[PDB]
Design a protein around this ligand. Sequence first.
Ligand SMILES: Nc1nc2c(ncn2[C@@H]2O[C@H](COP(=O)(O)OP(=O)(O)O)[C@@H](O)[C@H]2O)c(=O)[nH]1
Length: 165
Amino acid sequence: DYLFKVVLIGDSGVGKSNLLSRFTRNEFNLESKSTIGVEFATRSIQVDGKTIKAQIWDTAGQERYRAITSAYYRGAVGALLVYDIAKHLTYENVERWLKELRDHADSNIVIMLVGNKSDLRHLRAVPTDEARAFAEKNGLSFIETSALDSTNVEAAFQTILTEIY
Ligand SMILES: Nc1nc2c(ncn2[C@@H]2O[C@H](COP(=O)(O)OP(=O)(O)O)[C@@H](O)[C@H]2O)c(=O)[nH]1
């Protein structure tokens, strides 16, 4: 009975924890209940008429010691690389996360670029187009999600799990 390991990465405050709670329990929390360290939780999904088990990992990013960083990426078959569409700096940091994946993760890890906080359209600072072309260029999948209103959260996880299984 195998649990596919999928890691969340991206700047602190982008809603990674909320994506986790959406995917595992379909919950949202305005007051962040983000891990102070590393956390994981499990989900069962029907992909291609089959049952797939996934463990989604999340990190505060407060610990950089080599043993935990190696442990976080060890065995990961998928990564959701998350930014906040209302913060250009989070989008700029995606290259840093892409680099971290190359440095510590399996070279064949499937990567999905996720623009979270789609609900805040008025405060948008990252055009869909730009992000999309970056993704295409770097060989990533791309989706915009809202943890708050649940838009595309399941779809995001489904897509990655389809390539992983
Ligand atoms: N408007 C909006 N806020 C969100 C969304 N996802 C998370 N947040 C909020 O952004 C803040 C940080 O989210 P959190 O999940 O803790 O970020 P993390 O550091 O990446 O885990 C929290 O106050 C969340 O309620 C979203 O999709 N839309």
